Amino acid sequence: TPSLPT
Amino acid sequence: RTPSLPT
Amino acid sequence: GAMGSMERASLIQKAKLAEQAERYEDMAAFMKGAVEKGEELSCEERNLLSVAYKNVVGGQRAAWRVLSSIEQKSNEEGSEEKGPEVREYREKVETELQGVCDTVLGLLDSHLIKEAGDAESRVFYLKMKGDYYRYLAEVATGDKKRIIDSARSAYQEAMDISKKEMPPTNPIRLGLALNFSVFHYEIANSPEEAISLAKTTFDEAMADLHTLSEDSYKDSTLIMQLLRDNLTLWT
Amino acid sequence: GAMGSMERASLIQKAKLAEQAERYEDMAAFMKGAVEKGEELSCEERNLLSVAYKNVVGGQRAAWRVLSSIEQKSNEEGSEEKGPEVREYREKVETELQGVCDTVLGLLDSHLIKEAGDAESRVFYLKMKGDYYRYLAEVATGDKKRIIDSARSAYQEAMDISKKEMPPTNPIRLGLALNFSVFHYEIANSPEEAISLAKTTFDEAMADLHTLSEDSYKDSTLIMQLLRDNLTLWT
Numbered sequence: 001t002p003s004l005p006t
Numbered sequence: 007r008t009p010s011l012p013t
Numbered sequence: 014g015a016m017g018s019m020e021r022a023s024l025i026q027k028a029k030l031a032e033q034a035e036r037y038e039d040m041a042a043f044m045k046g047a048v049e050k051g052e053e054l055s056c057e058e059r060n061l062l063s064v065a066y067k068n069v070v071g072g073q074r075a076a077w078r079v080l081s082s083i084e085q086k087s088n089e090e091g092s093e094e095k096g097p098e099v100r101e102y103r104e105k106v107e108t109e110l111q112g113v114c115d116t117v118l119g120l121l122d123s124h125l126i127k128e129a130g131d132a133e134s135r136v137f138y139l140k141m142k143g144d145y146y147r148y149l150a151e152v153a154t155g156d157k158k159r160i161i162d163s164a165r166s167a168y169q170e171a172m173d174i175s176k177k178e179m180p181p182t183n184p185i186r187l188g189l190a191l192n193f194s195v196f197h198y199e200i201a202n203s204p205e206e207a208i209s210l211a212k213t214t215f216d217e218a219m220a221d222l223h224t225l226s227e228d229s230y231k232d233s234t235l236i237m238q239l240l241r242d243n244l245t246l247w248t
Numbered sequence: 249g250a251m252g253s254m255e256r257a258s259l260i261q262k263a264k265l266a267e268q269a270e271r272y273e274d275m276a277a278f279m280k281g282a283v284e285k286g287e288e289l290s291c292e293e294r295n296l297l298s299v300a301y302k303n304v305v306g307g308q309r310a311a312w313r314v315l316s317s318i319e320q321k322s323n324e325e326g327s328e329e330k331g332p333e334v335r336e337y338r339e340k341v342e343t344e345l346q347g348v349c350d351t352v353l354g355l356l357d358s359h360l361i362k363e364a365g366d367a368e369s370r371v372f373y374l375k376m377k378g379d380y381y382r383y384l385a386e387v388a389t390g391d392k393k394r395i396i397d398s399a400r401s402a403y404q405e406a407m408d409i410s411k412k413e414m415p416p417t418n419p420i421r422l423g424l425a426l427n428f429s430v431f432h433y434e435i436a437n438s439p440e441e442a443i444s445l446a447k448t449t450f451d452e453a454m455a456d457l458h459t460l461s462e463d464s465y466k467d468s469t470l471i472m473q474l475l476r477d478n479l480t481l482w483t
């Protein structure tokens with residue numbers, strides 16, 4: 001599951 | 007500037 | 014501190030040069046040195062610190078995943094015995110990743126969180142504390158239980174401040190909820206808490222979208238769509 | 249050193265895992281350990297050593313170019329001062345780069361150049377010696393002269409061997425001629441010699457392509473195509 005990018 | 011062997 | 018003899022302003026200047034040169038380990042070292050000067054960070058500086066370490070740990074996590082994947086294939090119906098080397102090298106990358114996380118957590122504890130002079134910066138650093146314990150949790154086994162509690166407590170503190178002090182569409186608040194929800198699902202095996210948090214966050218933000226400028230609406234809906242992507246995967 | 253207690257086969261295995269993880273610093277250190285066991289490297293192991301250090305010094309060279317460009321702009325005509333920071337950080341990167349080049353040249357001189365009797369390995373290492381002196385020359389200005397003659401050379405010894413002992417389509421021989429032509433053009437201020445060398449190498453290779461299998465044809469023609477790309481840039 002992806003977390004906050006950048 | 008001129009490219010060399012990439013391998 | 015290798016950076017103890019350099020002026021704060023010079024460390025910030027070199028952190029920006031290292032960023033231009035994509036030298037993120039250098040950038041992180043310059044920023045650690047700036048933090049160790051003992052002064053508060055501006056929003057721009059806090060962001061430099063975060064960018065630098067996220068790049069470094071991100072590289073390390075990606076390499077750990079590649080090696081962990083090889084190591085598991087080493088142990089399946091996928092036959093041939095490879096010897097100890099994959100595990101040994103996975104352990105070497107893991108110990109370097111744990112080192113970087115401990116360095117970041119050290120800067121937050123001593124003393125960024127306690128000195129932070131507004132709600133936004135306190136939330137920002139507590140979310141980082143949650144995040145870097147979460148990265149330790151990904152590679153821990155124990156010890157893993159302790160780390161998972163620590164992550165939870167940092168994120169929960171950040172959530173309490175954000176709910177009191179920031180509007181429900183605030184991007185830092187939304188991104189905190191995003192990561193904390195990921196933590197519930199992926200780390201703490203608490204799928205119900207993950208869904209509850211993501212859903213509540215989404216609804217409470219949706220209620221205020223009509224009040225925003227065009228640019229703020231874009232910033233908020235972007236992160237709402239990240240919450241949405243996760244709800245769809247989980248739901 | 250830190251690799252002294254590890255088996256040679258385990259060093260090679262771990263260099264291959266480091267390559268898959270794109271951990272080229274680690275890759276280089278494992279290959280350096282393997283070279284220090286004192287056995288000749290195989291064809292495949294010379295390519296691992298080369299890829300490892302090429303990626304390490306590649307990153308350093310790219311960062312040095314970025315910082316050097318910033319530094320020249322700051323030293324420009326009509327500019328305000330910023331203090332010593334851009335020069336200091338450029339120097340830091342440059343010293344790191346020189347260090348890696350000196351590591352490689354030490355390995356070549358201390359271990360690899362002439363325990364090689366076969367033309368393939370002798371040419372590959374002398375070409376590499378030329379290349380790493382060429383990278384030192386890119387950052388030099390003296391002392392630049394002595395570094396340039398060292399590169400010339402090494403290349404020239406490689407060229408003499410390659411013309412006597414290898415056919416004109418051999419990929420090592422073609423790669424050597426490509427890099428020596430780049431040395432003439434970029435380093436030695438000898439564009440006419442660069443152009444004559446790329447032309448004659450290309451033409452002598454083209455005449456002998458008919459001798460090659462499909463897969464060897466592809467190996468040689470990809471390098472001939474780089475030669476042509478340089479010729480077209482330069483003319």
Ligand SMILES: COCC[C@@H]1CCCN1
Nearest residue numbers: 013295298299372420423
């Ligand atoms: C000596 O010819 C080839 C130089 C390097 C070896 C790895 C890829 N290309």
